């Protein structure tokens with residue numbers, strides 16, 4: 401499956417989805433599909449806006465995050481410190497999206513972190529994880545596309561509410 | 569230069585620009601830079617929303633289009649028949665972005681057409697033109713992405729305009745109903761002295777009237793007081 405074909409899944413979702421707002425659950429599932437990754441889309445404060453997970457659902461810690469609708473405040477803080485795309489992060493790096501208490505299971509895991517920016521502001525983080533294979537530049541194109549477009553969507557959303565708080 | 573580097577140049581514009589709105593004139597420059605193309609971004613009716621031209625600036629017709637801010641209605645109509653990306657279009661093809669009457673300059677040229685879609689609707693067209701070299705998959709990855717975000721941005725402007733429409737109607741109504749009959753009359757009299765026009769029936773009323781309007785956002789005040797809803801005057805008179 402060519403890179404062109406992969407980028408088209410995201411473009412198709414953006415072009416043809418209903419409503420003015422793209423659903424980040426849909427976006428997470430599309431990225432998950434074309435990069436074969438566990439996917440988190442999180443807010444500035446680590447609220448889970450969308451996810452699409454496979455192996456990670458076998459972790460009760462992960463499951464609890466999903467119930468709480470937040471990643472851990474510590475991981476959130478560490479994601480906010482990542483200022484540009486950081487890729488192929490290993491299981492011993494605190495930036496891993498995999499639970500370090502399952503080190504043997506995820507020994508070859510790779511994590512890539514995409515800061516989400518819009519309107520010149522940090523609006524969230526896109527996090528992708530694989531149990532095995534390294535990310536390559538094509539994966540990065542897809543990730544940064546996705547991150548850019550999520551950023552446009554959050555930016556529009558927040559300016560809808562900020563100008564509705566400006567009414568007051 | 570890698571595709572990743574090209575996408576980042578575009579993404580930097582999208583992520584870091586100022587204002588809520590992406591300026592399509594900037595997008596055309598950036599698309600042109602990372603694909604080495606002559607670029608048109610056009611609306612459904614062929615208005616040029618952004619262009620980045622080089623070799624095409626030689627042609628007099630092109631200069632004329634730029635000055636009218638429109639591509640020809642004929643070509644506009646031809647673009648609207650392209651429903652999928654069509655690439656590497658040559659000079660003797662009706663879809664070329666190059667002027668056929670300058671065939672000799674553009675004999676090896678290639679045109680790619682990218683429909684701009686949003687919310688299940690055609691919103692415009694991104695057109696790329698190169699003098700020499702064929703378009704490859706990198707160019708299409710960049711071009712279809714660019715077209716997608718332009719579509720999102722057109723969709724956002726349109727929606728924000730139907731929104732401002734509804735906000736203003738609601739704002740005018742909310743104010744009008746807050747006015748007593750006297751205040752309505754005072755406001756009419758105010759504009760029988762102001763045709764834009766300055767400050768300076770008793771006094772407490774006229775002031776009370778204008779304060780209800782400033783608070784509903786129908787007028788703003790400075791030494792001076794204007795309407796920023798160009799529809800308030802009619803709706804006022806009709807409310808008596």
Ligand SMILES: Nc1nc2c(ncn2[C@@H]2O[C@H](COP(=O)(O)OP(=O)(O)OP(=O)(O)O)[C@@H](O)[C@H]2O)c(=O)[nH]1
Nearest residue numbers: 421422423424425443444445447449553554557558
């Ligand atoms: N288009 C789109 N926007 C979303 C979606 N989910 C959340 N948002 C927007 O994303 C932004 C962040 O989500 P919030 O619900 O405010 O969560 P938060 O942690 O309080 O966000 P922060 O302001 O970063 O702290 C808000 O503007 C939401 O409106 C989604 O699925 N699609």
Ligand SMILES: Nc1nc2c(ncn2[C@@H]2O[C@H](COP(=O)(O)OP(=O)(O)OP(=O)(O)O)[C@@H](O)[C@H]2O)c(=O)[nH]1
Nearest residue numbers: 589590591592593611612613615617721722725726
């Ligand atoms: N974000 C953004 N939107 C733009 C820009 N230029 C034009 N638009 C929007 O693109 C849409 C089409 O442009 P128009 O100015 O309406 O030209 P038109 O020929 O009347 O467009 P149509 O109604 O589609 O036929 C409008 O909703 C504009 O607001 C731009 O530079 N940035």
Ligand SMILES: CC[C@H](C)[C@H](N)C(=O)O
Nearest residue numbers: 471475496497498499500
């Ligand atoms: C989603 C957070 C991940 C699992 C992080 N490495 C942690 O251990 O908390």
Ligand SMILES: CC[C@H](C)[C@H](N)C(=O)O
Nearest residue numbers: 639643664665666667668
């Ligand atoms: C931009 C329009 C172009 C030049 C088209 N091929 C024409 O000849 O009109």
